[PDB]
Amino acid sequence: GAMAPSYRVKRMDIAKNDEECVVNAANPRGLPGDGVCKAVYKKWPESFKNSATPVGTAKTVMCGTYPVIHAVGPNFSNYTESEGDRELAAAYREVAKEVTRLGVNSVAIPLLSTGVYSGGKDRLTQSLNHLFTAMDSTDADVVIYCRDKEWEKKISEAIQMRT
Ligand SMILES: Nc1noc2ccccc12
Ligand SMILES: Nc1noc2ccccc12
Ligand SMILES: Nc1noc2ccccc12
Ligand SMILES: [Cl-]
Ligand SMILES: [Cl-]
Numbered sequence: 001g002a003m004a005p006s007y008r009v010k011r012m013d014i015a016k017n018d019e020e021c022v023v024n025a026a027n028p029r030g031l032p033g034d035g036v037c038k039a040v041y042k043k044w045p046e047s048f049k050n051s052a053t054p055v056g057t058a059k060t061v062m063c064g065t066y067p068v069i070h071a072v073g074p075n076f077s078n079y080t081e082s083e084g085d086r087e088l089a090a091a092y093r094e095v096a097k098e099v100t101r102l103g104v105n106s107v108a109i110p111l112l113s114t115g116v117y118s119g120g121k122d123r124l125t126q127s128l129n130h131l132f133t134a135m136d137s138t139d140a141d142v143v144i145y146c147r148d149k150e151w152e153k154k155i156s157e158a159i160q161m162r163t
Helices: 036-043 081-102 124-135 149-161
Strands: 007-011 022-025 058-063 066-071 106-110 141-146
Touching (some): 066 081
Parallel strands (some): 007 141, 022 066, 022 106
């Protein structure tokens, strides 16, 4: 565990993280895909061997000794708001199980279902609150990666609010 488990947010490419493992915002088929997934495929391509896993689950594949946790959030274009919300919560619970099983002291994590799977809606709060529900009982240092300057401010505020 970390000596004083924390949440932090950084605005940069998750493929340049400084943590002991990474969560990929994966597709169910283990394909190279877009956004975070595209960077993850370029950085850790060996981790995509048998990475296919259903919506609402996480599957870990090693790149050397570095763990890549493939977490499949729902595509809100296809799911109802209700079913989508259930699957997005579930994906994060499976990430918390994997992080605990691996015994890492830190994890880099993107906000699942906020990009091309968002169904054209702002899901910062919905996705972040499911991340907190899952990860609050873990003792890993969590570092959230984002791209947008206004998202960095809102994520930083949400973390600071509960401190
Ligand atoms: N400023 C940036 N260039 O590329 C990125 C990828 C992810 C997050 C931030 C950046
Ligand atoms: N949080 C992110 N959204 O898009 C990205 C692309 C590369 C790495 C991180 C991010
Ligand atoms: N859907 C998004 N717009 O900007 C972002 C920045 C970081 C993560 C997700 C989004
Ligand atoms: Cl960067
Ligand atoms: Cl997404």
